[PDB]
Design a protein around this ligand. Structure first.
Ligand SMILES: [Cl-]
Ligand code: NI
Length: 341
């Protein structure tokens, strides 16, 4: 008879787990990311095929590439469940899972005989979701990473506070973000209302009239909104560039284009939120909109400070090689002018 504890997961399920935890699996969008942030990668005994098959957009897998070599626990990806026989064979002490319901968690736990803990990123429209922080704390307790959990959450909270502080009292310019991935890549018409990097900087997002979350808009409305600054999420950059080449007159009529105020940002939404990348993007956008309040911030160095803290490796360079990196975009050539704002 070994010592156990009872843990209340993000669905309010009480789960009994031995206190001695050494072997884990993390499945569903962003579950493995949180384990990476908690420095518990060496406990991971199986991995979704997704990590190797879809290699881009995720700092954690660039920081911990050895995870790709572990035995399969299933395909992964959105809407997939782990392979139960793989779980039974690997016998982790606990399975962490995201984006499932109680029925599903119960079924996996009962069929495998392995404790299942549901984690949650909660609302993706904020840097301070309490379910996300709770998830980090809870996995921290279960994994013996409690101090590290507090540190991760505090880092995120302080970054939010710092961005608010730096932006306090400045006039808010009009802005737009396009190119946002949403079940596939999209171009200029794919945006977001209540976009967290904008919201923390109180930027006047021209689509915020639409409410919150992902939006597809009529790009003719851009001609009326005429945002002072345009940010292109680099998951959609190729599509935007192709659109530009086909519709040069449309784009050249926008004041953002006229003034060279079109910039590339790194994608952060791949397999739910890459929190480091989202924060790095907010520092880059802040420097662009409010340069006097960011004179001490080199956005590329800051991205690597973030990644080094959360993931222990300076992966910005690899991200910039995948997507382009931070800088003004020259729409005719498709080049990113790195080190510009
Ligand atoms: Cl990240
Ligand atoms: Ni008990």
């Amino acid at each position: 008879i070994h010592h156990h504890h009872h843990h209340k997961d993000l669905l309010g399920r009480e789960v009994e787990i031995p206190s001695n935890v050494n072997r884990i699996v993390a499945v569903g969008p962003g579950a493995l990311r949180l384990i990476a942030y908690l420095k518990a990668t060496d406990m991971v005994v199986g991995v979704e095929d997704f990590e190797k098959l879809r290699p881009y957009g995720r700092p954690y897998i660039l920081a911990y590439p050895e995870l790709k070599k572990l035995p399969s626990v299933g395909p992964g990806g959105p809407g997939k469940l782990p392979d139960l026989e793989s779980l039974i064979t690997l016998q982790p002490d606990v399975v962490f899972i995201t984006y499932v319901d109680r029925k599903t968690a119960k079924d996996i736990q009962e069929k495998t005989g392995i404790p299942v803990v549901v984690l949650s990123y909660g609302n993706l429209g904020t840097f301070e979701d309490e379910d996300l922080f709770r998830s980090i704390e809870l996995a921290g307790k279960i994994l013996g990473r409690e101090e590290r959990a507090h540190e991760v959450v505090d880092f995120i909270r302080k970054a939010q506070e710092d961005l608010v502080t730096r932006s306090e009292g400045v006039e808010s310019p009009t802005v737009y973000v396009g190119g946002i991935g949403y079940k596939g890549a999209h171009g200029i018409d794919s945006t977001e209302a209540k976009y967290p990097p904008f919201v923390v900087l109180h930027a006047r997002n021209v689509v915020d009239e639409l409410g919150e979350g992902h939006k597809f808009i009529d790009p003719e409305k851009l001609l009326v909104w005429n945002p002072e600054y345009i940010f292109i999420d680099e998951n959609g950059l190729s599509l935007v560039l192709d659109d530009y080449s086909k519709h040069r007159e449309f784009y050249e009529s926008l004041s953002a284009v006229k003034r060279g105020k079109v910039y590339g940002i790194l994608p952060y939404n791949y397999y739910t939120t890459n929190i480091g990348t989202a924060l790095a993007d907010a520092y880059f956008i802040g420097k662009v909109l409010y340069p006097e309040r960011f004179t001490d911030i080199d956005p590329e160095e800051k991205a690597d400070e973030i990644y080094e803290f959360l993931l222990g490796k300076r992966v910005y360079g690899e991200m910039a090689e995948q997507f382009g990196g931070f800088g003004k975009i020259d729409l005719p050539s498709g080049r990113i002018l790195r080190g510009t704002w």
